């Protein structure tokens, strides 16, 4: 519905914090002040960090907006963004946005940040093949299958998720910056071909094996593989265990519901030097 | 032991066919003719195809040899090659050479062919990091872990082996020509990053699942993955079965010890167009 007469900012922008934002963006005195379509048309960029915004309702009326800095807010619904056709940059860290269908037709969208949103299903990213930078740190992502389509990415952050299978990243040969700390990664082989990498982080993995039965002499295959497929030699083994390539071996006269080992290994891919470090946890039954 | 007087070709080269070869190489009249170290020193290249040679004993006395065309012979031991330090090209198709330790210090060796030798263990190839072309078609290779070190390869043939896991090839970003027909491959994802490929062959895979129990309504996960991780849609399904993404489903009122499906899908990697085609066989118990 068209704004055919000057209309109070608060009648368009139902959220009180977001009305304050539009107010300061346009250098108005008060949220009750009136705005025109013409003033709203002038807005290229909204800086709205850390404002406890719960809804961007009314943002549909800003059609020329190219940049949205919405980090540190309380948003759960980004449907109103759906028709911001010239949106290039969207930063939504620390909200709780899980429905990403709303981005599916933002064809100019080049940079997206959705850190700390509690997201598991990233399948909607598949509609954004033009993306150049994507930050998804600190979520609950396990399956990154769909990322294989995002071959324009030069920067990708997946730190602090639940990812064990990094095979999908092998398509992404343009990547220069890749952050994979605090995942569940134990097998680096499928990264070996990313020779444009400049920066890579791989610290503090938590690899979890499927449980096996407890026995008093337990032999467990080392599953930690460097980019060349060599087994990584554990540096510390729990419960007085021993390494005998290719197996970690424990004497457990008494039952314990887990054992584990820590590894640490420098790794080079392309021009990037990382520290592949972590722990493999082995749960036990019976 | 030094050749200090002209010595009959047959006293140096114990194998009758190989003595004939040295004889024609040097344009002598008879195998009983005498040769000097000086004539043997002049030999750069030996063409010995299809001669039923059973031993190259005496070849140690040809130190300047750079090229050995030994295809179509009956060799089982290539120890005498061990000190041919300037050997650049070695073609041993259709012999039965399984001990490759003898090549470990041939630092100039750039091209190697060992097709049709009945080889399973290719771990000795790891000492040949300089290799540029490697042909291993028609053997019994399952595990190509060590190939990840051969990053100078521009041409690699692994056709007609027993390979299911092609993850190791992801390191090999220089590859231009890659032949993988008639293996056991079902998952192409780890190839996606090989963007220098020019020629690629992937036809007639035979993927084999681990057996599962027979049931009269059998649901089996499609495991065939394109380079982007998408499931490949079966084109023909045995025993009147049906596809319901992501599962192949059969009604088997009566027991049968296997079912299967055929797939066929064009695939592009780098500048290379292949036809990923094959069959997945599913054996059944009880």
From Swiss-Prot, chains A, B:
Effect of inactivating the gene: Deletion of inlB alone decreases host cell entry; the reduction varies from 99% to 37% depending on the cell line tested.
Intervals holding LRR repeats: 40-62, 63-86, 88-106, 107-128, 129-152, 154-172, 173-196
Top-level division of the source organism's lineage: Bacteria
Region of interest (Ig-like region), ranges: 206-284
Limits of the LRRCT domain: 206-286
Subcellular location: Secreted; Cytoplasm; Cell membrane
Domain LRRNT: 1-41
Regions annotated as coiled coil: none
Domain writeup: The N-terminus (36-79) resembles a truncated EF hand, the LRR region (80-240) has a curved form, while residues 241-321 form an Ig-like region; the whole region forms a curved tube. The LRR domain alone (31-241) binds mammalian MET and stimulates its Tyr-phosphorylation; the LRR plus Ig-like region (36-321) are required for receptor dimerization; adding the B-repeat allows the protein to scatter host cell colonies, and the GW domains, especially GW2 and GW3, potentiate MET activation.
Family recorded in the similarity comment: Belongs to the internalin family.
Role: Mediates the entry of L.monocytogenes into normally non-phagocytic mammalian host cells. Its host receptor is hepatocyte growth factor receptor (HGF receptor, a tyrosine kinase, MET) which is tyrosine-phosphorylated in response to InlB. Downstream targets MAPK1/MAPK3 (Erk1/2) and AKT are phosphorylated in response to InlB, which also causes cell colony scattering. Complement component 1 Q subcomponent-binding protein (gC1q-R, C1QBP) has been suggested to also act an InlB receptor, but this is less certain.
The protein's assembly and partners: Interacts via its LRR repeats plus the Ig-like region with the extracellular portion (residues 25-741) of its receptor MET; MET can bind HGF, its endogenous ligand, and InlB simultaneously. Probably forms a dimer upon interaction with host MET, which subsequently allows dimerization of the host MET and subsequent host signaling; dimerization probably occurs via the convex surface of InlB. Prevention of dimerization does not block interaction with MET but prevents downstream action.
Protein name: Internalin B
Residues of the full protein shown: 36 to 321 of 630
């Amino acid at each position: 519905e068209t704004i055919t007469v000057p209309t109070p900012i608060k009648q368009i922008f139902s959220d009180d914090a977001f009305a304050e934002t539009i107010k300061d963006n346009l250098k108005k005195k008060s949220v009750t002040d009136a705005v025109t379509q013409n003033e709203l048309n002038s807005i290229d960029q909204i800086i709205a960090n850390n404002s406890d915004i719960k809804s961007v309702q009314g943002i549909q009326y800003l059609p020329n907006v190219t940049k949205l800095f919405l980090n540190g807010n309380k948003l759960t619904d980004i449907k109103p963004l759906a028709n911001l056709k010239n949106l290039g940059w969207l930063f939504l860290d620390e909200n709780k946005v899980k429905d990403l269908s709303s981005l599916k037709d933002l064809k100019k969208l080049k940079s997206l940040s959705l850190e700390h949103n509690g997201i598991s299903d990233i399948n909607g990213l598949v509609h954004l093949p033009q993306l150049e930078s994507l930050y998804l740190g600190n979520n609950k992502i396990t399956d990154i299958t769909v990322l294989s389509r995002l071959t324009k990415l030069d920067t990708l952050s997946l730190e602090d998720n639940q990812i064990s299978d990094i095979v999908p990243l092998a398509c992404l040969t343009k990547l220069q910056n890749l952050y994979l700390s605090k995942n569940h990664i134990s097998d680096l082989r499928a990264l070996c071909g990313l020779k444009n990498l400049d920066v890579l982080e791989l610290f503090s993995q938590e690899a979890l094996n499927k449980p096996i039965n407890h026995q008093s002499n337990l032999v467990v295959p080392n599953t930690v593989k460097n980019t060349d497929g060599s087994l990584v030699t554990p540096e510390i083994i729990s419960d007085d265990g021993d390494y005998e390539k290719p197996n970690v071996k424990w004497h457990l006269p008494e039952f314990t519901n887990e054992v584990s080992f820590i590894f640490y290994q420098p790794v080079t891919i392309g021009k990037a030097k990382a520290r592949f470090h972590g722990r493999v946890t082995q749960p036990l039954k019976e």
